[PDB]
Amino acid sequence: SGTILIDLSPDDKEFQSVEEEMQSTVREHRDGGHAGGIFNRYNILKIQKVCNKKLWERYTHRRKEVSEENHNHANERMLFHGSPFVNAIIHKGFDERHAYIGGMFGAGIYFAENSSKSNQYVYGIGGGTGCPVHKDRSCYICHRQLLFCRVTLGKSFLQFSAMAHSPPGHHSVTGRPSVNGLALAEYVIYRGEQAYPEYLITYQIMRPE
Ligand SMILES: NS(=O)(=O)Cc1ccc(-c2nc3ccccc3c(=O)[nH]2)cc1
Ligand SMILES: [Zn+2]
Incomplete structure (x- = not known):
């Protein structure tokens, strides 16, 4: 594949800032925990930097194209992605x-500001049948993985709300929450x-006290 994973030390500022983004963007979900489990915080077990020259150059090439179409503004964000295919993505890239x-904004690749939103997809859509070992969507034992990803949004189509093409004249879609005042935005891109x-995060959800 060309992918190397470099472990970050928990003493590293980079580990600490990624962990803080993970922990601080947990929220409660309207499903009461059905899909992703019941928790307020995680036990972070490992954070690895994902290093692949080809995949990075693929990304920066497209980033430049988008920037040039949007007054030299890539509108780059760091966002969460949860998927049963995490281990394929880190080796082969998104596609x-x-x-x-x-998805509610069409067939594209979805990312979340709330880590807990991406956690709902670690075992599949709706949490699937939960962890493979115990069949438990709220498993507190099994190790989960999320990606913390660098994403180019360019000019993003704003959708107020409660693979396809991006809307004409746009590079992405932003799903803005219109009902749940505590929810953060979700985003869709239509090109891998x-x-x-950028980061592979291994964690458990923690059972509340
Ligand atoms: N196509 S598939 O076979 O890879 C199944 C799959 C479906 C949905 C997700 C997914 N949906 C989201 C929706 C909103 C916000 C964040 C996410 C996210 O991180 N992942 C991941 C994988
Ligand atoms: Zn389990």
């Missing part, structure tokens, strides 16, 4: 196989080259 075909899987 049409990683799209949410039934617009995201790079």
Whole structure:
């Protein structure tokens, strides 16, 4: 594949800032925990930097294209992605196989500001049948993985709300929450080259006291 994973020390500022983004963007979900489990915080077990020259150059090439189409503004974010295919993504990159075909903004690749939103997809859409070992969507034992990804949004189409093409004249879609005042935005891209899987985070959800 060309992918190397470099472990970050918990003493490293980079580990600490990624962990803080993970922990601080947990929220409660309208499903009461059905899909992703019941928790307020995680036990972070490992954070690895994902290093792949080809995939990075694929990303920066597309980033430049988007920037040049948007007054030299890539509108780059760091966003979470959860998927049963995390280990394929880090080796091969994002592509049409990683799209949410039934997503509310069409068939594209979905990312979240709330880590807990991406956690709902670690075992599949709706949490699937939960962890493979115990069949438990709220498993507190099994190790989960999320990606913290560098994403190029460019000019993003704003959708107020409660693989396809991006809307004409746009590079992405932003799903803005219109009902749940505590929810953060979600984003969709329609080209795998617009995201790079920068950090692989291994964690457990923690049972509340
Ligand atoms: N196509 S598939 O076979 O890879 C199944 C799949 C479906 C949905 C996701 C997914 N949906 C989201 C929706 C909103 C916000 C964040 C996410 C996210 O991180 N992942 C991941 C994988
Ligand atoms: Zn389990």
